[PDB]
Design a protein around this ligand. Structure first.
Ligand code: NA
Ligand code: NA
Ligand SMILES: [Zn+2]
Ligand SMILES: [Zn+2]
Lengths: 292, 292
């Protein structure tokens, strides 16, 4: 059941909890996410990257979501364009039926970022679609964020607040700038979004490594990081990496333990279950559980 | 573009070629099958087992197919219930939008098989849906097949003609009973269906084995078996095992060559390609290519 992204995030903003934004690239991922939402009674914020959209076809991406909505008509669902890179991409998503689009111009200077973002906002808003943007600079400047939000009229903002991600990659340990987050929150007074905050739960790790996987290069932030960010004003937490690892861990396991197995269901059923549980735990962690 | 099963198979029956009936259990399989049909200009006979329907949900199964039809409006597509086991299952498939249903009561005695098949036919025909049935007994008796088809009004029949399958499994290496096939074809004068005729292409077997797979128990039949079957009057060739081996082979390979890989696209993109190529080759082999 598709609704504006802002309808879900404004509630989270007002009531001070976080909503996991879960990516999907096919049916297996989508089904697991919906079942998680159903079992935890949590609103659903579903994300599709530009790569995922090319992979599925925007018609199949939206099509599958609409089908799942009819299964669980009681669950609020926002279909979100994850990291749109062009106005045309966001435009296509809007026409396709997305209820939320992100335009990422955070790698550009303030003025150009504001220009492109404002352009997307005008288009999306005219079609009743919510918009997300990103802003940094190194950590974001709260007063810059204030002006950016005011002039762009974006619905939610992803501020650079400690994660090594996108145009704000750094060398060393990621650290949540809590006070900076609170300042941004106070000055903007809109839902805030957290990017590049992969948690890699212990059990998920262990499942992947047990299946012969290698995670050297994928180190996650503590659960405390996510909890503190939510207390700081974060209302949307992008979740993809954690889903992939749990999913593929099971795929590797099945391959290892039975060389003669080629029934897709045998691979992807456990994979779905693992992914579903990650989503469920994330919903409880962020506080979106029992919010329906 | 959904058309009734008999529309596609009757053309194959008249012109003496075979149409591959390809199973799918998710998006990846379905997409590869459609791309294959598009690239070989071949009609599409898509199959969904009761297990696949349980896995996907009949709403998603039909839903995805309808979406794919909109992508390739020029390709005739028959959505087929593979090995339905009850009247209710066939009925649910019909109400869901399937354009062809198979009721498998071949493990029952003639009278009971005919009775259930006839009931399914009455229901399906009333809804404009084609029906497939199966008959044996050991090899099928042509005269029995003649009476079965005449009294049941079934659209196409799967005769036990040499393959180890279902209620007609055996120990030795399968041999096509060509003259028996010809007699059944001669007496029934309807499209015939071949079950349990997996023909793993050399490259497919190699790919799966190279990836550390084990195929003990999946020998199958030579291409010539399929070719002679079509010459004999077979118009529908169930294809599932061959698709899954090609698909999983690539999945295993990706898992083997990079332990740090958990991008689902990296796994399933090559998997789709492999499956697509199997379908394309099968279409050319059976002679459905360039028939659109
Ligand atoms: Na985003
Ligand atoms: Na069948
Ligand atoms: Zn970002
Ligand atoms: Zn059969």
């Amino acid at each position: 059941m598709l609704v504006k992204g802002n309808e879900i995030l404004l509630k989270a903003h007002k009531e001070g909890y976080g909503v996991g934004a879960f990516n999907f690239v096919n049916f297996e991922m989508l089904n697991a996410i919906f079942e998680a939402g159903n079992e935890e009674n949590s609103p659903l914020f579903i994300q599709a990257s530009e790569g995922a959209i090319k992979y599925m076809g925007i018609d199949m991406a939206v099509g599958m979501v609409k089908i799942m909505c009819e299964r669980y008509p009681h669950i609020p669902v926002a279909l979100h364009l994850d990291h749109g890179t062009t106005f045309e991409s966001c435009e296509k998503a809007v026409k396709a039926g997305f209820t939320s689009v992100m335009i990422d111009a955070s790698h550009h200077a303030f003025e150009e970022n504001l220009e492109l973002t404002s352009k997307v906002v005008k288009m999306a808003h005219n079609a009743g679609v919510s918009v997300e943007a990103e802003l940094g600079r190194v950590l974001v400047n709260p007063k810059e964020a204030e002006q950016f939000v005011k002039e762009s009229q974006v619905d939610y903002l992803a501020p650079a607040i400690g994660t090594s991600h996108g145009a704000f990659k750094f060398k060393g340990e990621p650290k949540l700038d809590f006070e900076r987050l609170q300042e941004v929150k106070r000055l903007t007074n809109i839902p805030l979004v957290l990017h590049g905050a992969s948690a890699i739960p212990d059990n998920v790790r262990k499942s992947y490594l047990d299946a012969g996987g290698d995670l050297k290069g994928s180190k996650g932030v503590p659960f405390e990081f996510l909890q503190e960010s939510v207390k700081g004003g974060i209302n949307k937490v992008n979740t993809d990496t954690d889903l992939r690892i749990a999913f593929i861990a099971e795929v590797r396991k099945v391959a290892n333990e039975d060389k003669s197995q080629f029934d897709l269901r045998k691979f992807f059923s456990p994979a779905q279950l693992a992914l579903k549980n990650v989503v469920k735990e994330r919903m409880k962690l962020l506080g979106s559980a029992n919010k329906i």
